[PDB]
Amino acid sequence: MNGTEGPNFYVPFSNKTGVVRSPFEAPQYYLAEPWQFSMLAAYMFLLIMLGFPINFLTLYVTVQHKKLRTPLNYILLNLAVADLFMVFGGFTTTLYTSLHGYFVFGPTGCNLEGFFATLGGEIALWSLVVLAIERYVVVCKPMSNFRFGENHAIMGVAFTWVMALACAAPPLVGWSRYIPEGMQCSCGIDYYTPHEETNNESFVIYMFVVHFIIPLIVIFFCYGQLVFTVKEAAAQQQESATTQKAEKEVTRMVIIMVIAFLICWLPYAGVAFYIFTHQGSDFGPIFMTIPAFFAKTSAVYNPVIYIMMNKQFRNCMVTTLCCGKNDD
Amino acid sequence: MNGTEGPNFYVPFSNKTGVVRSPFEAPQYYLAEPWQFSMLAAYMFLLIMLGFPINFLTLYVTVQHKKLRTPLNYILLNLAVADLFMVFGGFTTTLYTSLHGYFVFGPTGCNLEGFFATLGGEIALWSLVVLAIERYVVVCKPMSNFRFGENHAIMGVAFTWVMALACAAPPLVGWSRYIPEGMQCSCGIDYYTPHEETNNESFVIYMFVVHFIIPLIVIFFCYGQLVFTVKEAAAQQQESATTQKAEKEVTRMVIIMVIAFLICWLPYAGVAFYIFTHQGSDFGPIFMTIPAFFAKTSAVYNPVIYIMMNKQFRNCMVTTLCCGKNDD
Numbered sequence: 001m002n003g004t005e006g007p008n009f010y011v012p013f014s015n016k017t018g019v020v021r022s023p024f025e026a027p028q029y030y031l032a033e034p035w036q037f038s039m040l041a042a043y044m045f046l047l048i049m050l051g052f053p054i055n056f057l058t059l060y061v062t063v064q065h066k067k068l069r070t071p072l073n074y075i076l077l078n079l080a081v082a083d084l085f086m087v088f089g090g091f092t093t094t095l096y097t098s099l100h101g102y103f104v105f106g107p108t109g110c111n112l113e114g115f116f117a118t119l120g121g122e123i124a125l126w127s128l129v130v131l132a133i134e135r136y137v138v139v140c141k142p143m144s145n146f147r148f149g150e151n152h153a154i155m156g157v158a159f160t161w162v163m164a165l166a167c168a169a170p171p172l173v174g175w176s177r178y179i180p181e182g183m184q185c186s187c188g189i190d191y192y193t194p195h196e197e198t199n200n201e202s203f204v205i206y207m208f209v210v211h212f213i214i215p216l217i218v219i220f221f222c223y224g225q226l227v228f229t230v231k232e233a234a235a236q237q238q239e240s241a242t243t244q245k246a247e248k249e250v251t252r253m254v255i256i257m258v259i260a261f262l263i264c265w266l267p268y269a270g271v272a273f274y275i276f277t278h279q280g281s282d283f284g285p286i287f288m289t290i291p292a293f294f295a296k297t298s299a300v301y302n303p304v305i306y307i308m309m310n311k312q313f314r315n316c317m318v319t320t321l322c323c324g325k326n327d328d
Numbered sequence: 329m330n331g332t333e334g335p336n337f338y339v340p341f342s343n344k345t346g347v348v349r350s351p352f353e354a355p356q357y358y359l360a361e362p363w364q365f366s367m368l369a370a371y372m373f374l375l376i377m378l379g380f381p382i383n384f385l386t387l388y389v390t391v392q393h394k395k396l397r398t399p400l401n402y403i404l405l406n407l408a409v410a411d412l413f414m415v416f417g418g419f420t421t422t423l424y425t426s427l428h429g430y431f432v433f434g435p436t437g438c439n440l441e442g443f444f445a446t447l448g449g450e451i452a453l454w455s456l457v458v459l460a461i462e463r464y465v466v467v468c469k470p471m472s473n474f475r476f477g478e479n480h481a482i483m484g485v486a487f488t489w490v491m492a493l494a495c496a497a498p499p500l501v502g503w504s505r506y507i508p509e510g511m512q513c514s515c516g517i518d519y520y521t522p523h524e525e526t527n528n529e530s531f532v533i534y535m536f537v538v539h540f541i542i543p544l545i546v547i548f549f550c551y552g553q554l555v556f557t558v559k560e561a562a563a564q565q566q567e568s569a570t571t572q573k574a575e576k577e578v579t580r581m582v583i584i585m586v587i588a589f590l591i592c593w594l595p596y597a598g599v600a601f602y603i604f605t606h607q608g609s610d611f612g613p614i615f616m617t618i619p620a621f622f623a624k625t626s627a628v629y630n631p632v633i634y635i636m637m638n639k640q641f642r643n644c645m646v647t648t649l650c651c652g653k654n655d656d
C-alpha cells in the first residue's frame with residue numbers, strides 16, 4: 001500500500017514501518033520535518049493577520065459609504081464576508097492543527113477546515129459568475145430593458161451562497177466527506193478513497209462539473225459576449241467614451257479577479273483531479289500540501305485586487321481611514 | 329501589429345519589412361526555413377502512408393468478419409472511415425500545401441484541410457462518448473432490462489456524425505471560418521480574429537463548450553460510474569470473473585483511447601484557447617504548427633490502439649492477412 005487508509009483518513013505514507021498514525025489521534029511528524037509544520041503554522045498566521053483586517057476593512061468601508069451600492073460593491077462586500085468565514089471558521093483551526101501537527105479537534109475540526117475553505121472558494125467562484133453576467137447585461141444590454149440594480153444585487157449574493165453551500169454542505173451530512181490532505185493539516189473533499197457508503201465518486205464528479213466547469217463555461221460565455229461587443233456590438237449601441245473608460249476599469253478588474261482565481265485554484269484542482277484518477281498511486285504529503293495551502297490565499301487576494309483596481313473604493317477607503325478626507 | 333491580418337488570413341509575422349504575403353497567393357518561406365516545410369511535407373506523407381493502410385485494413389477486416397458486430401467493433405469501423413476522410417479529404421491537401429509552402433488551392437483548399445481535420449477529431453471525440461456510455465450501460469446496467477445491441481450501434485455511429493458536422497460544417501457556411509495557422513500550411517478554426525461578419529467569437533465558445541467540454545463531462549461521468557461499480561456496485565451484480573476479464577480488456581482499452589485523445593488534442597486545444605484570449609499578441613508560426621500537425625496523428629493512433637489491445641480484432645486481422653489460418 002502506497003498510502004495508509006483508515007476508517008476516516010488517508011495518510012499519503014507507507015505503513016511498512018508501522019509509524020503511520022491517524023491524523024486525528026497523533027502528530028504527523030513522521031511525514032515531514034517539524035520545521036515544515038512550523039512553516040505552515042507561520043503561513044496560516046500571516047493569512048489570518050492579513051485576511052482579518054483587509055476583509056473587515058472592506059466590509060466596514062462599504063457599509064459606511066452609502067454611495068457604494070452597485071453590483072460590484074455588493075459582490076465584494078459578499079467576498080469580504082466569505083473570507084471572514086474562511087479566516088475565523090477555518091484558518092484558526094488549520095493554524096492550530098499545524099502547531100500540533102494533527103487534528104486534535106478530531107473530525108469536527110477537519111470539517112470546519114474543509115467546510116469554510118470549500119465554502120469560501122466556491123463563494124468566490126460563483127460570485128465571479130454573477131459579476132460576469134452583470135458585466136454582460138450592463139455592457140451589452142441583451143435581454144430587454146430591465147435594471148440589474150440593487151434588487152438583483154441582493155439576489156445575486158444569495159445565489160452565490162446557495163450554490164456554494166450546495167457544494168460545501170453535502171459532505172457534512174453523508175455525501176462525500178472532509179478528510180485530511182498532504183501533511184494532514186488541512187482538509188479537503190475525499191478524492192482519495194471510493195468509500196461507497198458516502199458515495200464519494202459521484203460527489204467528486206458533481207463538484208468538478210457543477211462547481212468548477214459549469215461556472216467557467218458561464219464566465220467564458222460572458223467573456224465571449226464582451227470581446228465581441230467591445231469590437232462591433234458596441235459602436236452601434238453608442239457607448240459614450242466617458243462611460244466606457246469607467247466601465248472598462250470595472251470590466252478589466254473582473255477579468256483580473258477571474259484570472260487570479262485560476263492562478264489560485266487550478267493548482268489544487270489539478271492535484272485533486274489527479275489523485276482522484278490515480279487513487280492508491282504513490283504520492284507524498286507534499287504533493288497536495290503546497291497547492292492546498294496556496295489556495296488559501298483566496299481569503300486575501302480579492303479585497304486587495306479591489307482596493308488596487310477600483311479608484312472609487314480606494315478613495316472611500318482612504319477617506320474612512322483618514323476620517324473625513326484623503327465619501328458617501 | 330504583431331501579426332498581419334488580411335481579408336481571410338492571419339500570418340503570425342510582423343509586416344514592418346513588407347515581406348508578409350497572403351498564404352493563398354504566395355509561398356511562406358519568409359516565415360521559417362524551407363527545410364522545415366519539407367519536414368512538414370515528409371511528416372504528412374508518413375501520416376498518409378500509415379493512415380491509408382491501417383484504417384482501410386481495419387475497415388476491411390471488420391466488414392469481412394461477421395462476428396465483429398459489437399458496439400466497439402462498430403465504433404472502430406466508424407473511426408476507420410473518419411480517418412480515411414482525414415487522410416484523403418485533408419492530408420493530401422496539407423501535404424501538397426506544405427510542398428508549395430502555401431495554399432495554392434486557395435481558400436477552398438484551406439476548407440478541405442480544416443474541415444476533415446475538425447471532422448475527424450470531433451468524430452473521434454464523440455465516438456469516445458458513445459463508447460463510455462456503452463461501457464456504462466454494459467458494466468453497470470442502470471436502465472431497466474435494456475439491450476445496447478446492433479441497432480443502437482448504428483444509432484451511435486450516426487450520432488457521432490451529427491455532432492461532428494455540427495462543429496465542422498458551420499464554418500463552411502458563414503459561422504466562423506477555416507483559416508491558415510502556424511507556418512500557414514494547415515487550417516483551423518479562426519481563433520485569430522473577431523471578424524464579426526462571421527460571428528467568430530460565438531463559434532469558438534460554442535466549439536470549446538459543446539465540442540470539447542460537454543463531451544468530456546459525459547465521459548468523466550461514465551468513468552465515475554465505472555470506478556464506483558468496479559468497486560462496490562458490481563460485487564452485487566455477480567459479474568462472473570470470466571466475463572469481467574474480457575469486459576475489463578475492453579474497458580481498459582476505451583480508457584486508453586480516451587487518454588490518447590487528450591494526449592493528442594490537448595496541446596492544440598491549449599494553444600487555440602490561448603491565441604483566442606490573446607488575439608494580436610506576439611507569437612510565431614511555430615507556436616501553433618507543432619500542436620496542429622501533432623494532432624493529425626489522430627488519423628492513425630486509434631486503429632493501432634485497437635489492434636494492440638483487442639485480441640479478437642487482432643486475431644481476425646492476422647487471419648484476414650494470412651488467409652484462413654493465422655475467423656467470423
Ligand SMILES: *[C@@H]1O[C@H](CO)[C@@H](O[C@@H]2O[C@H](CO)[C@@H](O[C@@H]3O[C@H](CO)[C@@H](O)[C@H](O)[C@@H]3O)[C@H](O)[C@H]2NC(C)=O)[C@H](O)[C@H]1NC(C)=O
Binds near residue numbers: 001003
Ligand atoms: C503503488 O505505487 C507503485 C509505484 O511506486 C505502483 O506500482 C506499479 O504497478 C504497475 C501495475 O502492476 C506495474 O506495472 C507492471 O510492470 C510489469 C513489469 O515487471 C509489467 O510486466 C506489467 O504488465 C505492468 O506494466 C509497475 O511496474 C509498478 N511500478 C511502476 C513502474 O510504476 C502500484 O500500482 C501502486 N499501488 C499499490 C498500492 O500497489
Ligand SMILES: *[C@@H]1O[C@H](CO)[C@@H](O[C@@H]2O[C@H](CO)[C@@H](O[C@@H]3O[C@H](CO)[C@@H](O)[C@H](O)[C@@H]3O)[C@H](O)[C@H]2NC(C)=O)[C@H](O)[C@H]1NC(C)=O
Binds near residue numbers: 004016017019020
Ligand atoms: C501501522 O502499523 C502499525 C504496526 O506495524 C500499527 O500499530 C498498531 O499499534 C497499536 C498500539 O497503539 C496496536 O494495538 C495493540 O493491539 C494489541 C492486540 O493486537 C493489544 O493487545 C494492545 O493492547 C494494543 O491495543 C496495534 O495492534 C498495531 N497494529 C498492528 C498493525 O499491529 C498501526 O496501527 C498502523 N497504522 C495505521 C493505524 O494504519
Ligand SMILES: *[C@@H]1O[C@H](CO)[C@@H](O[C@@H]2O[C@H](CO)[C@@H](O[C@@H]3O[C@H](CO)[C@@H](O)[C@H](O)[C@@H]3O)[C@H](O)[C@H]2NC(C)=O)[C@H](O)[C@H]1NC(C)=O
Binds near residue numbers: 329330608609610
Ligand atoms: C504586440 O506584442 C507586444 C509585446 O511583444 C505587446 O506590447 C505590450 O503591451 C503592453 C500593454 O498592453 C505594454 O505594457 C505597458 O507597459 C508600460 C511600460 O512602459 C506601462 O506603463 C503600461 O501600464 C503597460 O503595463 C508592454 O510594455 C508591451 N510590450 C512591449 C515591450 O511592447 C502588444 O500589446 C501586442 N499588440 C500590439 C499592441 O501590437
Ligand SMILES: *[C@@H]1O[C@H](CO)[C@@H](O[C@@H]2O[C@H](CO)[C@@H](O[C@@H]3O[C@H](CO)[C@@H](O)[C@H](O)[C@@H]3O)[C@H](O)[C@H]2NC(C)=O)[C@H](O)[C@H]1NC(C)=O
Binds near residue numbers: 333334346349350
Ligand atoms: C506588407 O507590406 C507590403 C509593402 O510594405 C504590402 O505590399 C505592397 O502593397 C502595396 C499596396 O497594396 C502595393 O502597392 C501598389 O501600388 C500600385 C501603384 O501602381 C497601386 O496601383 C496598387 O493599388 C498598390 O497600392 C505594393 O505593390 C506591394 N509591395 C510589394 C511589391 O510587395 C503587403 O500587401 C503587406 N502584406 C499584406 C499582404 O498584408
Ligand SMILES: CCCCCCCCOCCOCCOCCOCCO
Binds near residue numbers: 270273274277590591
Ligand atoms: C497530459 C494528459 C495525460 C492523460 C492523463 C489522463 C487525465 C486527463 O488529464 C486531465 C487534463 O489535464 C491536463 C493535465 O495533464 C497532466 C496529466 O495528469 C493527469 C491529471 O490527472
Ligand SMILES: CCCCCCCCOCCOCCOCCOCCO
Binds near residue numbers: 259598601602603605
Ligand atoms: C509554468 C506555467 C505558468 C503559467 C500559467 C498561467 C495561468 C494563467 O491562467 C489562465 C487560465 O488558462 C487556463 C490554463 O492556464 C494555462 C496557461 O494559461 C494561458 C491561457 O490560455
Ligand SMILES: *C/C=C(C)/C=C\C=C(C)\C=C\C1=C(C)CCCC1(C)C
Binds near residue numbers: 189269272292295
Ligand atoms: C486549504 C483547504 C482546502 C483548499 C480545502 C478544500 C477545497 C476544496 C474542496 C475546493 C474545491 C474547488 C474550488 C473552491 C474551486 C475550484 C474547483 C474545486 C472543485 C477544486
Ligand SMILES: *C/C=C(C)/C=C\C=C(C)\C=C\C1=C(C)CCCC1(C)C
Binds near residue numbers: 535
Ligand atoms: C491539422 C489541422 C487541424 C488540427 C485543424 C483544425 C482542428 C480543430 C478546429 C479542432 C478542434 C477540436 C477538436 C477536434 C477536439 C478537441 C477540442 C477542439 C475544439 C480544439
Ligand SMILES: CCCCCCCCCCCC[N+](C)(C)[O-]
Binds near residue numbers: 262263266268271273
Ligand atoms: C496554475 C496552473 C497549474 C495547473 C493547474 C491545472 C492542473 C490540471 C491538470 C492536473 C495536472 C497537475 N499534476 C501535477 C497534478 O499532474
Ligand SMILES: CCCCCCCCCCCC[N+](C)(C)[O-]
Binds near residue numbers: 601
Ligand atoms: C476551455 C479551455 C481548454 C484549455 C485546455 C488547455 C490545455 C493546456 C495545453 C497547453 C496550453 C499552454 N500554452 C499557454 C502554452 O498554450
Ligand SMILES: [Zn+2]
Binds near residue numbers: 147148149150151152
Ligand atoms: Zn433592480
Ligand SMILES: [Zn+2]
Binds near residue numbers: 475476478480
Ligand atoms: Zn439493440
